[PDB]
Amino acid sequence: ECLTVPSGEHGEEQRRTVHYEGGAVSVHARSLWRLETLRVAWSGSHIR
Amino acid sequence: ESTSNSKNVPPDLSICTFVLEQSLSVRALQEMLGGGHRTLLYGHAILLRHSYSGMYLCCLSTSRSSTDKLAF
Amino acid sequence: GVEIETISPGDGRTFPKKGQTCVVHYTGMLQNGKKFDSSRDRNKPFKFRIGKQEVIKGFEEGAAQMSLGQRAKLTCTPDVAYGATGHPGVIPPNATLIFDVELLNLE
Amino acid sequence: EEKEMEKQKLLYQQARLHDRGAAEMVLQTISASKGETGPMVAATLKLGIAILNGGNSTVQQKMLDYLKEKKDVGFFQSLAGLMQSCSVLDLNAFERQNKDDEFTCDLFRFLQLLCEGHNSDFQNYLRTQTGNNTTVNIIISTVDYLLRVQESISDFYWYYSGKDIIDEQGQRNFS
Amino acid sequence: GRLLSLVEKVTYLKKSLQQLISETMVRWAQESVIEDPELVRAMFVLLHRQYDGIGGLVRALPKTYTINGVSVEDTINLLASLGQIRSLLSVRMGKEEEKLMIRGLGDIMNNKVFYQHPNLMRALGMHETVMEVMVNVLGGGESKEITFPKMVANCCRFLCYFCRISRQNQKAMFDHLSYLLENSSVGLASPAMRGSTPLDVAAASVMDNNELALALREPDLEKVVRYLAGCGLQSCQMLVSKGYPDIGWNPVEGERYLDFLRFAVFCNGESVEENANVVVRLLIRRPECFGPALRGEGGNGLLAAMEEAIKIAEDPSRDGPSPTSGSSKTMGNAIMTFYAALIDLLGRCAPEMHLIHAGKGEAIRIRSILRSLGDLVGVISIAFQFCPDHKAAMVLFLDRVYVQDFLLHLLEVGFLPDLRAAASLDTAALSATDMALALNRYLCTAVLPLL
Amino acid sequence: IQRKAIMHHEGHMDDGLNLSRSQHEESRTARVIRSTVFLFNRFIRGLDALSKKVKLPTIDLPIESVSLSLQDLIGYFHPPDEHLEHEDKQNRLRALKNRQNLFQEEGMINLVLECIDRLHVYSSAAHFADVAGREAGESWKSILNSLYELLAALIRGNRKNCAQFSGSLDWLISRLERLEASSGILEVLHCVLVESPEALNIIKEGHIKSIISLLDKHGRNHKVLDVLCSLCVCHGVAVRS
Amino acid sequence: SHVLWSRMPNQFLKVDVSRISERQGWLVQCLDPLQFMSLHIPEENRSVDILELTEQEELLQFHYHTLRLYSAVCALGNHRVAHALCSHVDEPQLLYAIENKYMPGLLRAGYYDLLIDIHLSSYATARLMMNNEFIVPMTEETKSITLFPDENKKHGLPGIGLSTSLRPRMRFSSPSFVSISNDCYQYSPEFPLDILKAKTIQMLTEAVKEGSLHARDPVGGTTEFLFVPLIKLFYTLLIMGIFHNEDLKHILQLIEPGLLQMKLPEPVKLQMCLLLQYLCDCQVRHRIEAIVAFSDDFVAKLQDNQRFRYNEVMQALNMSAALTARK
Amino acid sequence: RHRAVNLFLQGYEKSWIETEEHYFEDKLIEDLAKPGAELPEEDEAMKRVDPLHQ
């Protein structure tokens, strides 16, 4: 699977919801996240 | 990007990123007519790079901002 | 109808009978001098017996109104020609036709 | 001296080919073949062993340098899918018939000819692919193929383990 | 020596063109570094070809076929229809003259050439052309835009039956069964409710062949029983094909799979064991012959569902709520004929006692599992209780799965078929000559109880 | 498949989270989601919302920056400059196909190209010229033609995407009623037909005769091949119907 | 909006008339015909010579793309459209277009391709589809079709030699239509084929000498427009079997003892490869025809050996399975 | 006449006819597709880009 978000046919509030789909979205945009780590310096440290 | 309010809202660190692509003394000046993990000295010429958007922030003819009315 | 007009008539009386290949060597024309057909460029004399309804009856009636060796300027009309339908791609609707008909032989 | 001349003409014949990117063509075609068993890659791998044909160091290092330069995931992915796609004895079909192999031989012969001469660099890179984002263990894949061979031939014994002799189809399927 | 001297002349590398092409193409590639990859493609092609002149000969002998001078008119009509239909596939070619496709198919059916000659229609790839035209019709699901696949009629009802002259014509349709795996189509050009007329392609392909029914495989059939599991839905209205738009007669979805699988398991004489085993194994995981209401499953019991569908059948029409229109309606059927074809297939699957295997070769598990479904002894009530051909299935089941006390509960194959067959051979307006075969066939169902 | 997930107390033990990075080639995949997608969505959202007679400087109307934005989109979606070598050109085509399909699964068929068409709200650029500031419909041509170019380039580029214009043919008719961007309509058509016909199966007299009336106002486009003959034949590989 | 432009320096002429003017009543005469191609077009007209357009490049692309459209609607077999078209583009336009020497290469190749696309696009296409069948009948003509005409094992020639192959046929119609597309694709009308067969020989024998001299001026612009449309029409007419062994001997006399040794561009070599391909097709057809000629007497003599030592199969005694069958 | 002799010679062609007599082409065609004999006034002697390399 991957932590998918539903597509942008409903850009208002339903994009805040969550669903899982191990299909073709596992390469694509909606199954992508980011580790916006709180630390400023060494934010590109090896995360543990 | 205000990282002082890191707890109230996030800061976007990725857009703030910068990279030291090159650095030389001022005498390194040829004008067209590396070392590898060299150190960094004060007074030497520095080159920056915005990381994901490869736009080399550098000496450009920027004469657009007039908030102070004489400033680049 | 077929308002026949002679150009260089021959004997003037060898009219075509039934089952007689009018060996016609015409050059078909439209109004304005815009050509749409020709047998001289082909060197293939047109052939048709009478009554079998191959050609429009402009040719049939004019040939019947025509002798052997008779160069003539035929003048068909939309009722006998393709009419408001028109042979598509070439002929538009509601067209009056002209033919430099020249009957040669009958077999 | 006859064997020496044979090896010299062998290496000359190989030099007619791999000096013109024949090995690069071989790896390109294997990488394009994304784990499909076919005769095009069969002719490729025949050509690969032909240029190799005794552990030519030149085609070895050429192939390796090409792979490291390109970082091609598709080559080792293709070898993985190939060894997954390779066939087995299928004794049920043999039972119904009582009323694919040379491909794998040349595959593993090409893979052997990479590491011939104690070429440690293939022996690592065929394990790790350290210069690339992702990694594949070719060695595990041939090992898994060996296990799938083992279970089939063991069932093949256990069929005739109760019987007295073996027919010509049976000994051929053995061999 | 005749053949040998001819071979020496043919194997002369015979006939200037060769040396000319070989020197000029290599000179062309020599004298400049050439772009246009198609040119160098053709150059090296001709270069390889002029050495391998035999290669032109090897892929010509299977295609060429000699005929006599008499057959050089209908064969030219066949070649004309074939070049036409090659200008109706893809190349200069396709669909929109559906009349011309149908008419070329009709001329090709009516042609008198492959009747006499052993190998023309296979070598020319007529089957390839017809199947190509069918996929070009179909493309994908949800539409069936052209509802006239007489290509099905062509291949099934002529090509697989011209294989009496050459059985390897059916081999090609067995190879294209590999395409029917992905061209598993649900569309019927027949009476046409829902019932997959290109299943007739596979049926004619594995109709009667021990070798080819043995060469069948489980993934050819797992999907089929999955589709039959998909058939396990209730019947609500007259023809819910997928919603009953205006016309209501009768839905049938499950039967034709069973009709195919009958051919799949059952050879000419005795049935097949390699297939029937895995068949019943897969059925027992998902046995979805769900009638109106019984325990455990929906149905899995014939008499209750058959009597309920007979209440639906007789006084109403095919549907339950409809005004009394049903007779010879082969919703009555798909609830009666569905179980009929089911039990026909099942009787065809299992073996007999005192056979080659007298229940001593692991056929006992399957014969017990059959015997665990009793209602089976109770099917004599069904064997008395419109279609007389349904009861052929259950009597075949009793014959194949199943002492004279059991004969003598009935005392006969059935007293009513006996009387009705003795009396239906007296010509009358009604109740006469409908059963000139519908119960005169029951010698085929009644004689084998001789023993 | 729709396994919605909730932060349970413990829940299932066998809920392991394996990972898959944006690998080295997918540095571009990591790039575009931040660079070309979210910002472009916000820009065109503000611009489209302000096309509805909303007060100009209150919400996003940076027409210089929307212009530079779509310029950067077009330069970023540029063709690979054919003169280059085989390998790097085909890898640029790979990257182009990847960003195109990543846009696609982000919503080209539903969101992005819908926003391009929903930005095409121009009754007349001259009438709009004296409504909102001093400029509404200057580079309408640029956005329309160029983003419709990369649209059909996507449809071409991955060989079964015949999705928006061949699929939603009403939005193709939304071009044929306007008749200024006749440059990319063929770009949809000729790449559709080598794949499979869906655009051509429904067009009719009312489209072709309007195209002919347009042709009377024309001197033979010089891709008259690729529009009007590929309307028929598809350049030597043809569907009959 | 154009402007009526006052200074129009452009193509005048090169040949007026061979008029003669004698005395004795001031007799004048001219027995030397000449024709030229006008231009007057319903959606926009401009009466000029076709040779007048080599300077201006706003109607050349117009006429060129319309030629391509005309060849497109008449593509892959569509004969109603050719019957309508042939009114517009009657044959002597085509014959003068191929035969003229001053015209641009674009409209040259367009006119040529349009001719092929209403003349040699469905029959030739069809027999190419059926070329790789080699369906044989067994006749006495199919027995003197041996590998060599001579005992010397001489190299033969591909185009000459009997075929005895059930090739599909050629039929025709007339422009004023009846039975417009039933089976009529020699042309949409009837085309005079032999005059074109002579004209292609004439123009190829012209172009070999035009290109031998390294001329500044080929016919249309460059040598590609000279040789390509001519040679592709020659290819279409060669594969149809219209050419005779005298024509084929002359064709070999061009190139065997030539055109191939000449410098040429790449898309000309592209077509020479197809010519050589059809030569090899003719040779292979001759080969298997000779093999069938052998196979008749061989199967006869060999089943005669079974008939010699008569041997039989199950109770239907002396069946033809003894000769040829298994079942 | 019949197809049977055509397939006779089909089976005969693989066994009695096809051999090294024309499968000697492999080394010869590569000896003749390697050279690239030209004099382009920049090569050492020949091999602009040989046919096999193309």
PDB file of C-alpha atoms in Angstrom, chain C residues 3-76:
ATOM      1  CA  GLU C   3     -32.215  22.517 -77.410  1.00  0.00           C
ATOM      2  CA  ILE C   4     -29.928  21.036 -80.042  1.00  0.00           C
ATOM      3  CA  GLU C   5     -27.717  23.331 -82.124  1.00  0.00           C
ATOM      4  CA  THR C   6     -25.703  22.168 -85.124  1.00  0.00           C
ATOM      5  CA  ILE C   7     -22.048  23.047 -85.763  1.00  0.00           C
ATOM      6  CA  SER C   8     -20.962  21.062 -88.846  1.00  0.00           C
ATOM      7  CA  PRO C   9     -23.769  18.661 -89.799  1.00  0.00           C
ATOM      8  CA  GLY C  10     -23.127  15.883 -92.298  1.00  0.00           C
ATOM      9  CA  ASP C  11     -25.860  13.973 -94.112  1.00  0.00           C
ATOM     10  CA  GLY C  12     -28.382  15.384 -91.635  1.00  0.00           C
ATOM     11  CA  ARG C  13     -30.765  12.372 -91.692  1.00  0.00           C
ATOM     12  CA  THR C  14     -28.929   9.262 -90.348  1.00  0.00           C
ATOM     13  CA  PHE C  15     -30.796   9.337 -87.048  1.00  0.00           C
ATOM     14  CA  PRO C  16     -30.136   6.621 -84.430  1.00  0.00           C
ATOM     15  CA  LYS C  17     -32.392   3.600 -84.035  1.00  0.00           C
ATOM     16  CA  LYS C  18     -33.019   1.336 -81.054  1.00  0.00           C
ATOM     17  CA  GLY C  19     -30.015  -0.707 -80.001  1.00  0.00           C
ATOM     18  CA  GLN C  20     -27.505   1.442 -81.899  1.00  0.00           C
ATOM     19  CA  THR C  21     -24.210   2.404 -80.252  1.00  0.00           C
ATOM     20  CA  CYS C  22     -24.015   6.142 -80.758  1.00  0.00           C
ATOM     21  CA  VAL C  23     -20.242   6.378 -81.092  1.00  0.00           C
ATOM     22  CA  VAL C  24     -20.149   9.794 -79.449  1.00  0.00           C
ATOM     23  CA  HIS C  25     -16.846  11.666 -79.126  1.00  0.00           C
ATOM     24  CA  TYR C  26     -18.236  14.565 -77.126  1.00  0.00           C
ATOM     25  CA  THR C  27     -16.579  17.145 -74.901  1.00  0.00           C
ATOM     26  CA  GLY C  28     -18.794  17.765 -71.914  1.00  0.00           C
ATOM     27  CA  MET C  29     -19.127  21.297 -70.606  1.00  0.00           C
ATOM     28  CA  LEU C  30     -20.960  23.377 -68.029  1.00  0.00           C
ATOM     29  CA  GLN C  31     -22.014  27.001 -68.002  1.00  0.00           C
ATOM     30  CA  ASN C  32     -19.295  29.704 -67.688  1.00  0.00           C
ATOM     31  CA  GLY C  33     -16.963  27.625 -69.900  1.00  0.00           C
ATOM     32  CA  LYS C  34     -15.989  25.418 -66.943  1.00  0.00           C
ATOM     33  CA  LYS C  35     -15.174  21.976 -68.287  1.00  0.00           C
ATOM     34  CA  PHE C  36     -16.382  18.904 -66.395  1.00  0.00           C
ATOM     35  CA  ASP C  37     -15.943  16.070 -68.925  1.00  0.00           C
ATOM     36  CA  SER C  38     -14.166  15.160 -72.131  1.00  0.00           C
ATOM     37  CA  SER C  39     -13.797  12.221 -74.511  1.00  0.00           C
ATOM     38  CA  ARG C  40     -11.284  13.853 -76.881  1.00  0.00           C
ATOM     39  CA  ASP C  41      -8.632  13.997 -74.149  1.00  0.00           C
ATOM     40  CA  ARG C  42      -9.301  10.298 -73.532  1.00  0.00           C
ATOM     41  CA  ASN C  43      -9.325   9.298 -77.219  1.00  0.00           C
ATOM     42  CA  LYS C  44     -12.179   6.994 -76.140  1.00  0.00           C
ATOM     43  CA  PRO C  45     -15.375   7.714 -78.121  1.00  0.00           C
ATOM     44  CA  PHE C  46     -18.371   7.359 -75.834  1.00  0.00           C
ATOM     45  CA  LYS C  47     -20.755   4.539 -76.787  1.00  0.00           C
ATOM     46  CA  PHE C  48     -24.385   4.028 -75.804  1.00  0.00           C
ATOM     47  CA  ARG C  49     -27.423   2.320 -77.279  1.00  0.00           C
ATOM     48  CA  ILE C  50     -30.826   4.032 -77.118  1.00  0.00           C
ATOM     49  CA  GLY C  51     -33.444   3.379 -74.450  1.00  0.00           C
ATOM     50  CA  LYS C  52     -31.400   1.385 -71.921  1.00  0.00           C
ATOM     51  CA  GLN C  53     -30.979   4.427 -69.577  1.00  0.00           C
ATOM     52  CA  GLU C  54     -27.196   4.430 -69.162  1.00  0.00           C
ATOM     53  CA  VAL C  55     -26.707   8.149 -69.788  1.00  0.00           C
ATOM     54  CA  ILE C  56     -29.075  10.939 -68.804  1.00  0.00           C
ATOM     55  CA  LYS C  57     -31.760  11.322 -71.476  1.00  0.00           C
ATOM     56  CA  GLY C  58     -30.136  14.570 -72.618  1.00  0.00           C
ATOM     57  CA  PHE C  59     -27.738  12.424 -74.641  1.00  0.00           C
ATOM     58  CA  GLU C  60     -30.521  10.052 -75.692  1.00  0.00           C
ATOM     59  CA  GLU C  61     -32.911  12.785 -76.830  1.00  0.00           C
ATOM     60  CA  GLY C  62     -30.176  14.843 -78.479  1.00  0.00           C
ATOM     61  CA  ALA C  63     -28.775  11.794 -80.275  1.00  0.00           C
ATOM     62  CA  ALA C  64     -32.329  11.017 -81.402  1.00  0.00           C
ATOM     63  CA  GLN C  65     -32.470  14.675 -82.530  1.00  0.00           C
ATOM     64  CA  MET C  66     -29.138  14.187 -84.353  1.00  0.00           C
ATOM     65  CA  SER C  67     -27.754  12.594 -87.509  1.00  0.00           C
ATOM     66  CA  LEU C  68     -24.472  10.843 -88.265  1.00  0.00           C
ATOM     67  CA  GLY C  69     -21.294  12.903 -88.365  1.00  0.00           C
ATOM     68  CA  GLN C  70     -23.215  15.791 -86.787  1.00  0.00           C
ATOM     69  CA  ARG C  71     -21.110  18.047 -84.629  1.00  0.00           C
ATOM     70  CA  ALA C  72     -23.621  19.756 -82.357  1.00  0.00           C
ATOM     71  CA  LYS C  73     -23.811  21.866 -79.214  1.00  0.00           C
ATOM     72  CA  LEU C  74     -26.279  20.060 -76.974  1.00  0.00           C
ATOM     73  CA  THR C  75     -27.923  21.850 -74.042  1.00  0.00           C
ATOM     74  CA  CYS C  76     -29.272  19.615 -71.284  1.00  0.00           C
TER      75      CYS C  76
END
